[PDB]
Amino acid sequence: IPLGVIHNSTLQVSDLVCRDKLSSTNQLRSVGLNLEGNGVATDVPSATKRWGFRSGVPPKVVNYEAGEWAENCYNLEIKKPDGSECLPAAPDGIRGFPRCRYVHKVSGTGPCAGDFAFHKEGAFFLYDRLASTVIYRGTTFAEGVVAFLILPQYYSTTIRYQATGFGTNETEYL
């Protein structure tokens, strides 16, 4: 796992150095960075095409301490066309993303061939100080990645979407 060290205001990748100073656990920091900063498309039809359903892979949750303000967040309440639930319920201790300028709440029906929904690019779904590989029902999340560092010594708008055939190439919104 790569570790970042900030030297003379320049970030470097850790490699024995004998010149880096680490005297407390407060210097170690985990930061969750959103994918919107990288310039990816934030549109709801574009974002949903990066998510897929799979079975046999247990979900995993990692912890991060610092986050980034998100201009776009997503909330999913998706059911099967017969009324049965598609996404699992959020476990105890997992909450929505705290800072979200816009929350895109998407609801509707569509096929769900897997137990859990993953990210096709391998990224994580950021939650309140928790990063998970799967999407939980009715919880605000942001897509992003987590980095580890050695530190040197609010209004939200909700948008409603109605999607049919979610997870396919024939998905109609509103």
Epitope: K79, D82, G83, S84, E85, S107, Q162
Partner: nanobody, 119 residues
Framework: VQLVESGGGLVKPGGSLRLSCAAS????????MNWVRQAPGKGLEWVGR??????????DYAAPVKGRFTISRDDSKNTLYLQMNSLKTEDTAVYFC???????????WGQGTLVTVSS
């Protein structure tokens, strides 16, 4: 769990009718409702569907019956209403109301109401 259907009769083409299904033994407000019709000596045909109140209570209709049939539900009375307008000869079929009360897939089908449209 039981569904009882009523409201069928002989109606000339161009008339209107209202079909009602009564639900008991389960929570009617938390279950999706579907209408399926079967022509005499033919296969099953899907008419429409209405979602739960928590899901917005939207109604979707099949293409042949789109723009002429209206489906509504009464949560207080645990009853499902289907309003049929501009009836034609091809609409002569036995209508069924279907729902799922437990999501281990225990489904309930009504007895069926015969609607005859002839002149």
């Amino acid at each position: 769990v039981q569904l009882v259907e009523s409201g069928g009769g002989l109606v000339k083409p161009g008339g209107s009718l209202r079909l009602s299904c009564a639900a008991s033994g389960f929570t009617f407000s938390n279950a999706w409702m579907n209408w399926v019709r079967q022509a005499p000596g033919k296969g099953l045909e899907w008419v429409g569907r209405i979602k739960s109140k928590t899901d917005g209570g939207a109604a979707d209709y099949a293409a042949p019956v789109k723009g002429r049939f209206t489906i509504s539900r009464d949560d207080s009375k645990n009853t499902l209403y289907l309003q049929m307008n501009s009836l034609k000869t091809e609409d002569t079929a036995v209508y069924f109301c279907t729902t799922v009360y437990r999501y281990n897939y225990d489904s309930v089908w009504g007895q069926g109401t015969l609607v005859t449209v002839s002149s």
